[PDB]
Design an enzyme around this catalytic site. Sequence first.
Site, PDB file in Angstrom:
ATOM      1  N   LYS A 240      75.566  53.712  71.402  1.00 36.61           N
ATOM      2  CA  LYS A 240      74.269  52.461  71.370  1.00 36.61           C
ATOM      3  C   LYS A 240      74.415  52.362  72.660  1.00 36.61           C
ATOM      4  O   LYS A 240      72.610  52.381  72.886  1.00 36.61           O
ATOM      5  CB  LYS A 240      74.789  51.635  70.654  1.00 36.61           C
ATOM      6  N   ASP A 259      71.651  49.901  66.462  1.00 34.53           N
ATOM      7  CA  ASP A 259      72.098  48.905  66.423  1.00 34.53           C
ATOM      8  C   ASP A 259      72.045  47.809  65.109  1.00 34.53           C
ATOM      9  O   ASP A 259      71.394  48.712  64.193  1.00 34.53           O
ATOM     10  CB  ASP A 259      72.263  48.581  67.449  1.00 34.53           C
TER      11      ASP A 259
HETATM   12  C1  LIG Z   1      70.906  40.107  70.134  1.00 34.10           C
HETATM   13  C2  LIG Z   1      70.629  41.132  71.615  1.00 34.10           C
HETATM   14  C3  LIG Z   1      69.488  41.238  72.110  1.00 34.10           C
HETATM   15  C4  LIG Z   1      69.753  42.783  72.359  1.00 34.10           C
HETATM   16  C5  LIG Z   1      70.583  43.003  73.479  1.00 34.10           C
HETATM   17  C6  LIG Z   1      70.405  44.302  73.828  1.00 34.10           C
HETATM   18  N1  LIG Z   1      69.142  45.019  74.621  1.00 34.10           N
HETATM   19  C7  LIG Z   1      68.921  46.217  73.807  1.00 34.10           C
HETATM   20  O1  LIG Z   1      69.484  46.196  72.982  1.00 34.10           O
HETATM   21  C8  LIG Z   1      66.869  47.062  73.788  1.00 34.10           C
HETATM   22  C9  LIG Z   1      66.380  45.958  74.150  1.00 34.10           C
HETATM   23  C10 LIG Z   1      65.021  46.781  73.710  1.00 34.10           C
HETATM   24  C11 LIG Z   1      65.634  48.112  73.557  1.00 34.10           C
HETATM   25  F1  LIG Z   1      63.595  48.384  73.809  1.00 34.10           F
HETATM   26  N2  LIG Z   1      66.327  48.469  72.593  1.00 34.10           N
HETATM   27  C12 LIG Z   1      67.667  47.597  73.176  1.00 34.10           C
HETATM   28  C13 LIG Z   1      71.807  42.851  73.291  1.00 34.10           C
HETATM   29  C14 LIG Z   1      71.616  41.432  71.643  1.00 34.10           C
END
Ligand SMILES: Cc1ccc(CNC(=O)c2ccc(F)nc2)cc1
Length: 312
Positions: A240, A259
């Site tokens: 991830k 995820d």
């Molecule tokens: C609740 C939460 C939200 C975001 C994150 C980290 N960001 C991503 O996984 C992410 C964001 C944008 C994208 F285009 N792809 C992946 C961790 C927890």
Amino acid sequence: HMRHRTLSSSPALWASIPCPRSELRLDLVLASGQSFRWKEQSPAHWSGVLADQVWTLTQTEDQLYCTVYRGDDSQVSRPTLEELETLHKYFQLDVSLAQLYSHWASVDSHFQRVAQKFQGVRLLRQDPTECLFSFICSSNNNIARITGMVERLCQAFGPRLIQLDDVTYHGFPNLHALAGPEAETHLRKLGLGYRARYVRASAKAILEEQGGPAWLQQLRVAPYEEAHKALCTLPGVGAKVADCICLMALDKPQAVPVDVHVWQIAHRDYGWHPKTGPSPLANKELGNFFRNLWGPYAGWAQAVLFSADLRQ
Ligand SMILES: Cc1ccc(CNC(=O)c2ccc(F)nc2)cc1
Ligand code: NI
């Protein structure tokens, strides 16, 4: 003493880049969990550190306004040509998002519906060292908490750049600063928990087993699959996190980080089930599914739906 700018306060110190709100919405990009370094310090004005400099950003319907703060000891002035190119590359504005949105919409009705409301969600092209360590802090966490840990990490380990109002801005630390004997102890004191170990140990690994930061630049020109597998050798970096970095810092627009949110999106909104619950193998399969469907900018398409899933 120095204060954050607004477009009112200081209009001589802003430059502008022609940029429609269909190519970029700041509010959907700067707080959607790509970068954790941007804050809306006054309404519609986003401030944050890019490299060794602070910026404030705001936009109209068709213009992106920006202003640079390069330190207390320097004559305050508009952004230079080179500084404006840096920003253009950060938002990858060479790439048409309206053209990608229409290509994605042509194969996916659901994307068409959601995209209509969530225009201008694109991918930042980030510094690999910041993205790497920001996403090691992202495990089992929320955006507000990650933001806290990254800010405290930069305060404790990284160079002070400037203070605007009550906010001190620090640069992201080099690997040597994070790799030291007390690094984990300090980071635990800053609230990172178990992630403190991964930070320190990954900083150490890149320096001693990979040759320092030139390794991350090499991954940026390596193919997606080689970059991903090389990232997964690092402590606290799994499928991830490696896909986030690949997508956000190593110029892999096809990386699709899977995820809880994307698994839920896929199931709920696409009716996808593994052909062979979550697992490493089923997550891999779901990334492949989205590449097959959306094409070589599948990660950008996913970011549109993630940002929307964040706004309920
Ligand atoms: C609740 C939460 C939200 C975001 C994150 C980290 N960001 C991503 O996984 C992410 C964001 C944008 C994208 F285009 N792809 C992946 C961790 C927890
Ligand atoms: Ni089902």
